[PDB]
């Protein structure tokens, strides 16, 4: 099970580095910067499409997998939420394609790309639902093979998209990578025969829909905080300097997201299920502290190694046209430690399913990101964004400990 997840995370990382490298070598810092706001929208779609209930889907599919009547209502209401929201999403993308292009790119020259997303997001919503269902039925193999195939065809789709369409093709490729996974997930769901197909018939259970709505509010809150913040910050950096300067700072985040993904799963399936079962404050503190005793030195060592080979990392994963960001590593990699450090406090809020505290944590990150950006970015450029990213999580980590200590007492 956990080795299936490792296989998925590995192929996903390798393919992500591969497509990230090809995008860098082909379109340079201007392309990496211009594409970042578009890549921010795709990940949000993976978070907030099909009502963003797929975390709750897997939880309740496994909870009611023994009761056939309640299992059918869970999958049935999940398909209904996906169908309704995927269709409304399509209408939103065809009618507001120009204003969405403006917010993401600064001009309306990407309307056709935004309108095409209306069809692409359907594969993301339906694909992630089929993956969530396979996770709920404890099918780690069917989940992993679907992700591996989806990553393999995503590289093929991205290569053909950018060769034909140019830069806007490469952007379409970045959306097609998570959307095409619905092809192997569907084929795997069929032949593995774990889930009856009639269960996918859209029905509506007001009980499960309201409970699954709480997962929708989480994705809603998540999608309109840090993504919105990072969008305005890259836009302000581009306006005061250039999109080429945004790609300098974007290359730093793109390099860190590689090793920061494997460490994420090291305290995801190992920490989140454990923090849910425990109920005593002493036992909560005994695992919050002991998780930091492993997570902090692990990211510190990994990030320090990246800074030790900052020149090699730039040359390897990107191009020597990104050499200017070697000075950004010290500030961003520090902020990475404090950000992942505060993740332990974030997964504690998710384990308690506290919407109140989840809202407070996301807006805290959003605010600190916005204040520190209006001061650093207009003066220091990409270094200002890397300094705002570090100043944010230096304060946010310290606030997270104070909030935890008050809550602990």
């Amino acid at each position, epitope marked *: 099970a956990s080795l299936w997840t490792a296989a998925s995370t590995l192929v996903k990382i390798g393919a992500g580095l591969l497509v990230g490298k090809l995008l860098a070598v082909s379109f340079g810092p201007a392309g990496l910067g211009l594409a970042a706001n578009f890549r921010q929208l795709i990940t949000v779609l993976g978070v907030l499409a099909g009502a963003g209930i797929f975390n709750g889907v897997t939880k309740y599919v496994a909870q009611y997998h023994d009761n056939p009547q309640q299992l059918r209502r869970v999958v049935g209401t999940s398909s209904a939420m996906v169908l309704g929201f995927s269709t409304l999403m399509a209408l939103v993308f065809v009618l507001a394609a120009a204003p969405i292009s403006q917010g993401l*790119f600064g*001009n309306t*020259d990407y309307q056709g790309l935004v309108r095409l997303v209306a069809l692409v997001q359907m594969g993301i919503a339906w694909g992630n639902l089929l993956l969530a269902l396979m996770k709920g039925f404890r099918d780690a193999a069917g989940n992993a093979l679907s992700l591996i195939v989806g990553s393999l065809i995503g590289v093929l789709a991205y290569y053909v998209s950018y060769r034909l369409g*140019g830069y*806007e093709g490469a952007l379409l490729g970045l959306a097609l990578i998570p959307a095409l996974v619905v092809i192997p997930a569907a084929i795997m769901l069929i032949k593995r025969g774990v889930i009856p197909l009639s269960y996918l018939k859209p029905s509506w259970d007001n009980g499960l829909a309201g409970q699954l709505s709480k997962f929708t509010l989480m994705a809603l809150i998540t999608s309109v905080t840090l993504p919105v913040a990072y969008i305005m910050m890259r836009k302000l950096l581009a306006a005061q300097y*250039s999109w080429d300067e945004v790609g300098i700072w974007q290359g730093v985040s793109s390099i860190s997201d590689a090793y920061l993904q494997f460490i994420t799963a090291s305290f995801s399936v190992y920490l989140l299920p454990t923090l849910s079962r425990l109920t005593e404050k002493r036992d909560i503190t005994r695992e919050v502290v002991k998780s930091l005793k492993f997570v902090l030195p692990a990211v510190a060592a990994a990030s320090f190694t990246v800074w030790l080979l900052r020149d090699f990392a730039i040359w390897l994963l990107l191009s020597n046209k990104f050499t200017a960001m070697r000075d950004l590593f010290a500030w961003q990699l520090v902020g990475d430690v404090l950000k992942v450090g505060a993740y332990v406090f974030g997964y504690l809020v998710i384990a308690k399913a506290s919407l109140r505290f989840y809202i407070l944590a996301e807006v805290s990150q959003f605010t600190l990101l916005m204040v520190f950006a209006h001061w650093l970015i207009p003066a220091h450029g990409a270094l200002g964004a890397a300094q705002a990213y570090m100043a944010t999580y230096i304060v946010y980590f310290s606030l997270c400990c104070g909030v935890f200590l008050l809550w602990r007492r």
Partner: nanobody
Amino acid sequence: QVQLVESGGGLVQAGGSLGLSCAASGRTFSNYVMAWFRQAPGKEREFVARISESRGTTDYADSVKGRFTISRDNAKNTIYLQMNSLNPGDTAVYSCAATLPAWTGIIGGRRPGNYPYWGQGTQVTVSS
């Protein structure tokens, strides 16, 4: 950062002619794929003409083919657009655009989103 400056435009009688020039301040100007785009109030920037970065191959919209001509002068970092046989359907804000060959692909040479560097735009108006 390649930056472009438009020059030209203004009033012109229907059927007449007008020349439009774009000047670029940047390195290795001959490496760039250069193009002309136009746009009416509210519409998306529409392709007009494009000139390659190597042999100088040109490409024109179906609505300007035969009337408009694009050309480049790599020694002066400028491109040109000679517009002949002007009709009211050519009243738009014309912009010059620069990009590298990889951004265009094989079929993406006419989409404005494949051009990251843009000029200021100049007004062109045809009478009747």
